[PDB]
């Protein structure tokens, strides 16, 4: 840990603060997530245990790389590959601009690649949103913050309830369905996709019911025809206003026929019919996909 020179404070979270640093020896810029543990308290936090253990299996060009874990008696340093911005700020600086379709498609392509990889190694991210997706100065985007992540089983079990930041939380979860899985991450990605296009959160609810209600208004209140089982779900109320399903082209106006399709499949109610990352890679939306390299602002 002496071959690193701190360079600044990046983004603090749970375990501790995150510095920027450079390996004085090889020149490689990295991010150092630190943990002082809970020495005479909780001990190594479960988030860090799930994050380090799962993250050390996921080696992929589209998942931030945990380069090393530095163990000392009183501190644990997690050395990550350094990425400049997160989608959240990138879009913010895209004032006027708008992320051009080519980059949205590139980004969507990369995210599915990295997410399909996670699902193939029984890992649910459960926290996809633009803050957690980091981009670099070469046109790449990668999934980050696997603190909420968890290794799943086949078949799945009942996992922690209410996961995923609200706006990006899937309908399965809000209805308090017994089991959720991989489809939850696909919902978050459908929302980020609509968001990259419109530059605005798709379902910016303030409570779970507001969220369901925004969801229903845009895709219609699901019934037993569209989602066999909805009406018997824990948090499904027969009093729910039944909204007609909005014409998809009105959901994200700038999108073509293809992108509409992909999005409609990503935002599919029934989690069993909602498209897989793996299968989304082969959609016509991506037939022209390239790797536009964006100029960053830092």
């Amino acid at each position: 840990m002496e071959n690193f020179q701190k360079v600044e404070k990046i983004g603090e979270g749970t375990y501790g603060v995150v510095y920027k640093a450079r390996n004085k020896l090889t020149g490689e810029v990295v991010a150092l997530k630190k943990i002082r543990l809970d020495t005479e308290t909780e001990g190594v936090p479960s988030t860090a245990i799930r994050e380090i253990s799962l993250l050390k299996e996921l080696n992929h060009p589209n998942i931030v790389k945990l380069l090393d874990v530095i163990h000392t008696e009183n501190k644990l340093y997690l050395v990550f590959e350094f990425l400049h911005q997160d989608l959240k700020k990138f879009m913010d600086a895209s004032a006027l601009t708008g992320i051009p379709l080519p980059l949205i498609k590139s980004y969507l392509f990369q995210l599915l690649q990295g997410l399909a990889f996670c699902h193939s190694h029984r890992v649910l991210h459960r926290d996809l949103k633009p803050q957690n997706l980091l981009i670099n100065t070469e046109g790449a985007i990668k999934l980050a913050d696997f603190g909420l992540a968890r290794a799943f089983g086949v078949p799945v079990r009942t996992y922690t309830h209410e996961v995923v930041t609200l706006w990006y939380r899937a309908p399965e979860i809000l209805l308090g369905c017994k089991y959720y899985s991989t489809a939850v991450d696909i919902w978050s990605l459908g929302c980020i996709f609509a968001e990259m296009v419109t530059r605005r959160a798709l379902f910016p609810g303030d409570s779970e019911i507001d969220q369901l209600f925004r969801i229903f208004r845009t895709l219609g209140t699901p019934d037993e025809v569209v989602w066999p089982g909805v009406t018997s779900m824990p948090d499904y109320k027969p009093s729910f206003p039944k909204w007609a399903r909005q014409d998809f082209s009105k959901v994200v106006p700038p999108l073509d026929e293809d992108g509409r399709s992909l999005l409609s499949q990503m935002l599919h109610y029934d989690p069993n019919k909602r498209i897989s990352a793996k299968a989304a890679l082969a959609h016509p939306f991506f037939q022209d996909v390239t790797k536009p390299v964006p100029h960053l602002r830092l």
Binding site: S53, V154, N272
Partner: protein, 258 residues
């Protein structure tokens, strides 16, 4: 979501070989024995019941333990400290609500301190290089069960019952991969409850056959057979509960006809 079943099955099959502990570790091990280890895993079964932990957490703790012991020599007086740290880790990793470290210090009744339990946790982490997402017998059983026609909860719980029994005894199960044991556990359960045998669709899936499973099946059978008079009895007494359909009460096949 079957869309990932085989990538995951194939992934687990690959990782199970990387978490494989030194199959000959007890021999080289100085102060502890198989019997002591059997005493330890049984206790952990109790701890799992006490804190109502998941079975997967049980399996995970044991996996961690066998791996730790495969490279670290441990004193009989120091073995439960390892067991508690592995159980604690297994808990944080798998549980929605894991017990607080105070609960774990309590269950090793007056024995160890919490700084001790905490320092061992850090050491189990150092030895295991943070590789905690280990494939367990339960993870395979869980997939196999999907090849029942139709699903029989008694076969399921019995399969689980037997897979757990294999945890107690390092001799002979420390040489069988989880997937194999999960195959033996499943077949022997299916047979004991429905007369049916290792399904063809599982041969396609796993590639394992009744004949690939014989060695392990022979062992698992004797274990099921001698179960009532095994020094340890927590799993038997655990699988009496309605939660597991009281399958420990079921009578094992006198023969397998293989």
């Amino acid at each position: 979501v079957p869309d990932y079943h085989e990538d995951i099955h194939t992934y687990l099959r690959e990782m199970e070989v990387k978490c494989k502990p030194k199959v000959g570790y007890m021999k080289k091990q100085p102060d502890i024995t198989n019997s002591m280890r059997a005493i330890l895993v049984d206790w952990l079964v109790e701890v799992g019941e006490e804190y109502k932990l998941q079975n997967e957490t049980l399996h995970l703790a044991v996996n961690y333990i066998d791996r730790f012991l495969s490279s670290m020599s441990v004193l009989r007086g120091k073995l439960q400290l390892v067991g508690t740290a592995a159980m604690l880790l297994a808990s944080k990793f798998e549980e929605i609500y894991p017990p607080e470290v105070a609960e774990f210090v309590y269950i090793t009744d007056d024995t160890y301190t919490k700084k001790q339990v905490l320092r061992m946790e850090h050491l189990v982490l150092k030895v295991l290089t943070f590789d905690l997402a280990a494939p367990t017998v339960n993870q395979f059983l869980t997939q196999y069960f999907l090849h029942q026609q139709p699903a029989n909860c008694k076969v399921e719980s019995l399969a689980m019952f037997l897979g757990e029994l294999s945890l107690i005894d390092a001799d002979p199960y420390l040489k069988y991969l989880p997937s194999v044991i999960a195959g033996a556990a499943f077949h022997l359960a299916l047979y004991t409850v429905t007369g049916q045998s290792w399904p063809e669709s599982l041969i396609r899936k796993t590639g394992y056959t009744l004949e690939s499973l014989k060695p392990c099946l022979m062992d698992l059978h004797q274990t099921y057979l001698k179960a009532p008079q095994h020094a340890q009895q927590s799993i038997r007494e655990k699988y009496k509960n309605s939660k597991y359909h009281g399958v420990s009460l079921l009578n094992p096949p006198e023969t397998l006809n293989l």
